[PDB]
Swiss-Prot record, chain A:
This is Large ribosomal subunit protein uL3. The lineage of its organism: Eukaryota, Fungi, Dikarya, Ascomycota, Saccharomycotina. Disruption phenotype: A mutant confers resistance to trichodermin, a trichotecene toxin produced by plant-pathogenic fungi. It is found in: Cytoplasm. Methylation at His-242 by HPM1 is required for proper 60S subunit assembly and promotes translational elongation fidelity. PANTHER family: 60S RIBOSOMAL PROTEIN L3-RELATED (PTHR11363), LARGE RIBOSOMAL SUBUNIT PROTEIN UL3 (PTHR11363:SF5). Belongs to the universal ribosomal protein uL3 family. SUPFAM superfamilies: Translation proteins. Component of the ribosome, a large ribonucleoprotein complex responsible for the synthesis of proteins in the cell. The small ribosomal subunit (SSU) binds messenger RNAs (mRNAs) and translates the encoded message by selecting cognate aminoacyl-transfer RNA (tRNA) molecules. The large subunit (LSU) contains the ribosomal catalytic site termed the peptidyl transferase center (PTC), which catalyzes the formation of peptide bonds, thereby polymerizing the amino acids delivered by tRNAs into a polypeptide chain. The modification Phosphoserine is found at S23, S155, S296. Present with 450 molecules/cell in log phase SD medium. PROSITE patterns: RIBOSOMAL_L3. The modification Pros-methylhistidine is found at H242. It comes from Saccharomyces cerevisiae (strain ATCC 204508 / S288c) (Baker's yeast).
Curated annotation (Swiss-Prot), chain B:
This is Large ribosomal subunit protein eL19A. Component of the ribosome, a large ribonucleoprotein complex responsible for the synthesis of proteins in the cell. The small ribosomal subunit (SSU) binds messenger RNAs (mRNAs) and translates the encoded message by selecting cognate aminoacyl-transfer RNA (tRNA) molecules. The large subunit (LSU) contains the ribosomal catalytic site termed the peptidyl transferase center (PTC), which catalyzes the formation of peptide bonds, thereby polymerizing the amino acids delivered by tRNAs into a polypeptide chain. There is a cross-link at K20, K52, K59 (Glycyl lysine isopeptide (Lys-Gly) (interchain with G-Cter in ubiquitin)). Keywords: Cytoplasm, Isopeptide bond, Phosphoprotein, Ribonucleoprotein, Ribosomal protein, Ubl conjugation. Its main location: cytoplasm. The modification Phosphoserine is found at S29, S36.
UniProtKB/Swiss-Prot annotation, chain C:
This is Large ribosomal subunit protein eL31A. GO terms for biological process: cytoplasmic translation; regulation of translational fidelity. Component of the large ribosomal subunit (LSU). Mature yeast ribosomes consist of a small (40S) and a large (60S) subunit. The 40S small subunit contains 1 molecule of ribosomal RNA (18S rRNA) and 33 different proteins (encoded by 57 genes). The large 60S subunit contains 3 rRNA molecules (25S, 5.8S and 5S rRNA) and 46 different proteins (encoded by 81 genes). One of its GO terms (molecular function) is structural constituent of ribosome. GO terms for cellular component: cytosol; cytosolic large ribosomal subunit. Gene3D superfamilies: 3.10.440.10. It comes from Saccharomyces cerevisiae (strain ATCC 204508 / S288c) (Baker's yeast). Component of the ribosome, a large ribonucleoprotein complex responsible for the synthesis of proteins in the cell. The small ribosomal subunit (SSU) binds messenger RNAs (mRNAs) and translates the encoded message by selecting cognate aminoacyl-transfer RNA (tRNA) molecules. The large subunit (LSU) contains the ribosomal catalytic site termed the peptidyl transferase center (PTC), which catalyzes the formation of peptide bonds, thereby polymerizing the amino acids delivered by tRNAs into a polypeptide chain. Signal peptide: none annotated. Keywords: Cytoplasm, Ribonucleoprotein, Ribosomal protein.
Swiss-Prot record, chain D:
The lineage of its organism: Eukaryota, Fungi, Dikarya, Ascomycota, Saccharomycotina. InterPro entries: Ribosomal_uL22, Ribosomal_uL22_CS, Ribosomal_uL22_euk/arc, Ribosomal_uL22_sf. Component of the large ribosomal subunit (LSU). Mature yeast ribosomes consist of a small (40S) and a large (60S) subunit. The 40S small subunit contains 1 molecule of ribosomal RNA (18S rRNA) and 33 different proteins (encoded by 57 genes). The large 60S subunit contains 3 rRNA molecules (25S, 5.8S and 5S rRNA) and 46 different proteins (encoded by 81 genes). uL22 is associated with the polypeptide exit tunnel. CDD domains: Ribosomal_L22. This is Large ribosomal subunit protein uL22A. One of its GO terms (biological process) is cleavage in ITS2 between 5.8S rRNA and LSU-rRNA of tricistronic rRNA transcript (SSU-rRNA, 5.8S rRNA, LSU-rRNA). Keywords: Cytoplasm, Isopeptide bond, Phosphoprotein, Ribonucleoprotein, Ribosomal protein, Ubl conjugation. GO terms for cellular component: cytoplasm; cytosol; cytosolic large ribosomal subunit; preribosome, large subunit precursor. One of its GO terms (molecular function) is structural constituent of ribosome.
Length: 386, 63, 109, 183
RNA sequence: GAAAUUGUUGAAAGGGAAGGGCAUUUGAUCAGACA
RNA sequence: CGUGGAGGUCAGUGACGAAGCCUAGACCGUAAGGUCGGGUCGAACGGCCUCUAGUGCAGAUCUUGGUGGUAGUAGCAAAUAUUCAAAUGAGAACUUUGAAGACUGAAGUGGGGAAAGGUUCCACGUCAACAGCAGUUGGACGUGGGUUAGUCGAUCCUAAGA
RNA sequence: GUGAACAGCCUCUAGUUGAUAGAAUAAUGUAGAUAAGGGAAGUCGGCAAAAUAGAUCCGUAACUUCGGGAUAAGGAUUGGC
């Protein structure tokens, strides 16, 4: 008859269907535009999300009432050991869109990837790639011509890398394998890069740097079957209502005589693909560096790992990426950090941060202490100890 | 094997509630033959069936 | 094959009973233990000593101790031949405190 | 006797029945079908595993609003169940068929279940009381069960017709020519 | 010892009903008539 | 055209198989229907002229009986609560005994009665049905046993009333 | 026993431990609870809920049929030894 009062609908029709994703590893739907004048480099990177903590830094933002004043900011830490290059895949343009014509693979593959190619490793004969590997024997003949073929054709080149999940506190042995588009040089320079890097290893610093705006592609946490109130942000029906009240009262007018695609309904919540953008890098840490979590201004030798270690994760003994604020996905989940699709000129983006302090107290309770040393200093000797 | 009867019989004979007649599980074959109050009386007299003590309700905290 | 062993374990009933409804806590503990026996001795046949029952229920349904010290004995079976030749008998061990002990073999004689 | 349609050497078969059994007709129908044509020895081990919840019985007709289980994958099915009482009656008749086979002197190694059919015994009536003073029927659906075990026999040889060939004047002349021409 | 309704066996069809009309292909099946 | 009975007739059919029933086999009729074969079956039945009527079903929220899809679905969620082991038994979550954990909490889930029921009491046997799982258990099933008065009641008396 | 108490709660004697069971703990429920800051803005309407409460002492208004209104209102106190 006409609402009565006007109000915005609940939730965003451009994130439908609200189904579980087809995979834990969210897909990269787009890579940065290519500029073949720059050197060849990855355009993204895998890691695992470790946890969060707090930061302190002076703000640089003329005209803001917090110009030149400290702010405290939340940040996430994603564990980021070097990635290892094991293949190259060459795509070609067609009136039906991008098609892959060949994949060339490294000759040796770590059991870490090989494991990915299996559903029952322990029982299996692990024959994966054992004939492929033999292709190298014959001087190189058939590998060169696939390489040759990628060069002759190919509108784009992506490289095949995987994670070193064993350098990670996780229990799940089976590594993550993925295509990252290469963006420097000529197509031919790209595959040269690719061949050169087989079995060899690549580091975040070769792909990201401080103060850069990056995006994160990941599968959202899971919540299983959710009713309408919390899944769509629908208003609780009144207390008096029969037949329950976390619902939608009217599921549609009489005509169309069909429930419509655009009304809220109970069903799965979370475990969605998301592509979240513009997360500034606050730290590019290095695994082989005590004072990881130390600062120009702090100075105390200590790493990012909180007392007792990241809750529900472990320790971080690898390079990491420290990103302002929060990111889709949970602790332990694979996560693609991606290069921005545009040069952002925001001033907010552009600002060059310098951490003055990284929180490092336990997250398993009300952390009172940054280090075991500080905690000894304050408590003195206890009944154990010396 | 079904000592229900002999237990009721036991309660009545001793003067106590069934909640307190003990029918000894290693003399079940002998107990089962005790159809009569005379045979339960003998079964009580020699310890095949015992009275089982009251549950104390001490008054010591009252006192 | 067979094997016939006795060892003494301490089972963490606390993390196994975490969350369980108050009127299932001592009942869960019976099942939980049984399950704990099979996992170690590989045996589907687990009998609990009546004393172990008492130990378990010593404080009523919802008051199970956080840690029991158990003795588990893999024994061979006799009579009307069962599905499996082996079975475990679980017993309480009179220890002052079930806190701080590690799993231990008991020499057979 | 007088079982359903069978197509089988009775000299090489044995058989068994239970009439009026108080098992669910629908559940034991699905479990009979789960066994139909099985090597006798394979089938027996199979029912044993059903009872152990290690494999399931696929429910293919009497199955709407049944649950789902990974144990239906091997049968290409998502709904499958574990009908204890059904399984035990069937293996009862099954074990009987075995005995009868031993009696006849049939090789127990070749036995497959070649016929297995359940259908509906007369229902048995009980009643339940419903709101507002009403009565409803509360009924059993018993089953008749019958099966036949047969010694499996290989081969079959050939032999049949010869197809009498009939062709016109113009048709046998071309033929006469095909030879007169070539080979 | 019918029908509704059911099990098994055999044969066939089945991209949001089924069933029906006129016509023919294909399969299966069968009467007659030749002398 | 078809049905139940009746008069006549065909010296009609039939235990060497009447009637009936089944049958994407045959044939006659525009059709109502009629005829055959085969299977099943078991004691009676049909053609023609004619007589007669309780004489033809898809319906009537028709009558009585039977049967489906619904569906192995709704459900079997009030009354705090169950556990270990032995014994018995083809079979034990559910029977018996032991142990333990609890409950009712003397305004009782204790110990008796009035009305009502009528054998349910008790013993031995025992599970086809019944006790909306089970069952070796039962207020079930089978077979037996059992209710003792000068003093307890009735009986006597009178009440409203009959 | 507590206590004003034949209340509630715990217990002795007696009697039960009967009420299909197993596994998980999605939505939505039924029944039981809690919520920062605000405080009826919700709603036909404070519906529901929350607040109050025992006892000892202090102290209690309009009005009145002089009996009341009145536990008016409003306060303090309360264990153990
Ligand atoms: Mg408008
Ligand atoms: Mg899928
Ligand atoms: Mg190719
Ligand atoms: Mg919720
Ligand atoms: Mg909202
Ligand atoms: Mg939200
Ligand atoms: Mg209402
Ligand atoms: Mg709503
Ligand atoms: Mg914390
Ligand atoms: Mg919980
Ligand atoms: Mg029959
Ligand atoms: Mg059906
Ligand atoms: Mg169905
Ligand atoms: Mg279902
Ligand atoms: Mg459905
Ligand atoms: Mg299916
Ligand atoms: Mg009812
Ligand atoms: Mg009624
Ligand atoms: Mg011819
Ligand atoms: Mg020619
Ligand atoms: Mg008959
Ligand atoms: Mg047609
Ligand atoms: Mg046609
Ligand atoms: Mg006529
Ligand atoms: Mg007539
Ligand atoms: Mg008549
Ligand atoms: Mg005939
Ligand atoms: Mg027909
Ligand atoms: Mg003819
Ligand atoms: Mg005939
Ligand atoms: Mg006769
Ligand atoms: Mg006439
Ligand atoms: Mg009439
Ligand atoms: Mg009509
Ligand atoms: Mg009709
Ligand atoms: Mg009709
Ligand atoms: Mg009509
Ligand atoms: Mg009708
Ligand atoms: Mg009816
Ligand atoms: Mg059923
Ligand atoms: Mg159900
Ligand atoms: Mg209900
Ligand atoms: Mg029970
Ligand atoms: Mg109590
Ligand atoms: Mg009381
Ligand atoms: Mg009772
Ligand atoms: Mg009495
Ligand atoms: Mg009575
Ligand atoms: Mg009795
Ligand atoms: Mg029975
Ligand atoms: Mg009854
Ligand atoms: Mg029953
Ligand atoms: Mg029964
Ligand atoms: Mg009797
Ligand atoms: Mg009698
Ligand atoms: Mg007198
Ligand atoms: Mg007298
Ligand atoms: Mg009683
Ligand atoms: Mg009930
Ligand atoms: Mg209850
Ligand atoms: Mg349940
Ligand atoms: Mg509040
Ligand atoms: Mg206020
Ligand atoms: Mg208002
Ligand atoms: Mg106000
Ligand atoms: Mg309003
Ligand atoms: Mg009003
Ligand atoms: Mg108003
Ligand atoms: Mg109210
Ligand atoms: Mg409050
Ligand atoms: Mg007043
Ligand atoms: Mg004081």
């Amino acid at each position: 008859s006409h609402r009565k009062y006007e109000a915005p609908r609940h939730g965003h029709l451009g994130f439908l269907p609200r189904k579980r994703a087809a995979s834990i590893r969210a897909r990269v739907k787009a890579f940065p535009k290519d500029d073949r004048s720059k050197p060849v480099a990855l355009t993204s990177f895998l890691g695992y999300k470790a946890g969060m903590t707090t930061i302190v830094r002076d703000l640089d933002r003329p005209g803001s009432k917090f110009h030149k004043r400290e702010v405290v900011e939340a940040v996430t830490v994603v564990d980021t050991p070097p990635v290892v290059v094991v293949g190259v895949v060459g795509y070609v343009e067609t009136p039906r869109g991008l098609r892959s014509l060949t994949t060339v693979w490294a000759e040796h593959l770590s059991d870490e990837v090989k494991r990915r190619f299996y559903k029952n490793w322990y029982k299996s004969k692990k024959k994966a790639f054992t004939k492929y590997s033999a292709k190298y024997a014959q001087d190189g003949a058939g590998i060169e011509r696939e390489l040759a073929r990628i060069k002759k054709y190919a509108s784009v080149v992506r490289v095949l890398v995987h994670t070193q999940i064993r350098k990670t506190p996780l229990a799940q042995k089976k590594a993550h394998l993925a295509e990252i588009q290469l963006n420097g040089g000529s197509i031919s320079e790209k595959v040269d890069w690719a061949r050169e890097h087989f079995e060899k290893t690549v580091a975040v610093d070769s792909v990201f740097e401080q103060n850069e705006m990056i995006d994160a592609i990941a599968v959202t946490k899971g919540h299983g079957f959710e009713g309408v109130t919390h899944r769509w942000g629908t208003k609780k029906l009144p207390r008096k209502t029969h037949r329950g009240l976390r619902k939608v009262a009217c599921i549609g007018a009489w005509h169309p005589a069909h429930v419509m695609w655009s009304v809220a309904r109970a069903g799965q919540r979370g475990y969605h693909s998301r592509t979240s953008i513009n997360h500034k890098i606050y730290r590019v840490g290095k695994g082989d560096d005590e004072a990881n979590g130390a600062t120009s201004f702090d100075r105390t030798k200590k790493t990012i790992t909180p007392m007792g270690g990241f809750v529900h994760y472990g320790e971080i003994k690898n390079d990491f990426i420290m990103v302002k604020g929060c990111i889709p996905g949970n602790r332990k989940r694979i996560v693609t950090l991606r290069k921005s699709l545009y040069t952002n000129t925001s001033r907010k983006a552009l600002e060059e941060v310098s951490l003055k302090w990284i929180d490092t107290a336990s997250k398993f309770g009300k952390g009172r202490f940054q280090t075991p040393a500080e905690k000894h200093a304050f408590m003195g000797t206890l009944k154990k100890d010396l | 094997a079904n000592l229900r009867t002999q237990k009721r019989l036991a309660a009545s004979v001793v003067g106590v509630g069934k909640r307190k007649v003990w029918l000894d599980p290693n003399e079940t074959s002998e107990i089962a033959q005790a159809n009569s109050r005379n045979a339960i009386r003998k079964l009580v007299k020699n310890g095949t069936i015992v009275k089982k003590a009251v549950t104390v309700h001490s008054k010591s905290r009252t006192r | 094959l067979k094997d016939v062993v006795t060892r003494e374990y301490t089972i963490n009933l606390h993390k196994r009973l975490h969350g369980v409804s108050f009127k299932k806590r001592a009942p869960r503990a019976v099942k939980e233990i049984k399950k704990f026996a099979k996992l170690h001795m590989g045996t589907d046949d687990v009998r609990l000593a009546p004393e172990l029952n008492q130990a378990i229920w010593k404080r009523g349904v919802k008051g199970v101790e956080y840690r029991l010290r158990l003795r588990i004995s893999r024994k061979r079976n006799e009579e009307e031949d069962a599905k499996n030749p082996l079975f475990s008998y679980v017993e309480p061990v009179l220890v002052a405190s079930a806190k701080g002990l590690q799993t231990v073999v008991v020499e057979e004689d | 006797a007088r079982y359903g349609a069978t197509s089988t050497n009775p000299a090489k078969s044995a058989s068994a029945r239970g009439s009026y059994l108080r098992v669910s007709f629908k559940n034991t129908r699905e479990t009979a079908q789960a066994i139909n044509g099985w090597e006798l020895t394979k089938a027996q081990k199979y029912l044993e595993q059903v009872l152990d919840h290690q494999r399931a019985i696929p429910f293919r007709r009497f199955n709407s609003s049944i649950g789902r289980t990974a144990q239906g994958k091997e049968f290409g099915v998502t709904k499958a169940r574990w009908p204890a009482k059904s399984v035990k009656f069937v293996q009862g008749l099954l074990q009987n068929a075995a005995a009868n086979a031993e009696a006849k002197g049939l090789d127990a190694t070749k036995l497959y279940v070649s016929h297995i059919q359940v259908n509906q015994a007369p229902k048995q009536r009980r009643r339940t009381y419903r709101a507002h003073g009403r009565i409803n029927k509360y009924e059993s659906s018993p089953s008749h069960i019958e099966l036949v075990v047969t010694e499996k026999e290989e081969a079959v040889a050939k032999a049949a017709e010869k197809k009498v060939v009939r062709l016109t004047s113009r048709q046998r002349g071309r033929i006469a020519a095909q030879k007169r021409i070539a080979a």
